[PDB]
């Protein structure tokens, strides 16, 4: 149901922190 | 419920701005 | 409503076109 | 429907292992 979309929607909300995180790795090999 | 979905919806819609122009940031240390 | 959720997802699957077009960019700049 | 939205994000839950490891391409180019 809409509890089990709005708790993939805060899984992806940690997918859009790792997007983040590991492009930051990246930048931080490149300054 | 269905409004706060569809306001996480327009926070992935924030996160696809940020997806493009912290590439971007990379693209421009690489021209 | 549901309609106007599904056509977000349907944005977000652009996105995710662009995530990988756009560091296929990159990793073509790197080979 | 919710079904065919469900399975949308179980899609983006794919897009997002393809984010990671072609993140991890360029990165793997870069150690």
Known sequence: ???XIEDK???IXSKXYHXEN???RI???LX
């Open 22 to 24: 590991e492009l930051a």
């Open 27 to 29: 930048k931080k090999l």
């Open 9 to 11: 929607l805060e899984e």
């Open 1 to 3: 149901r809409m509890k």
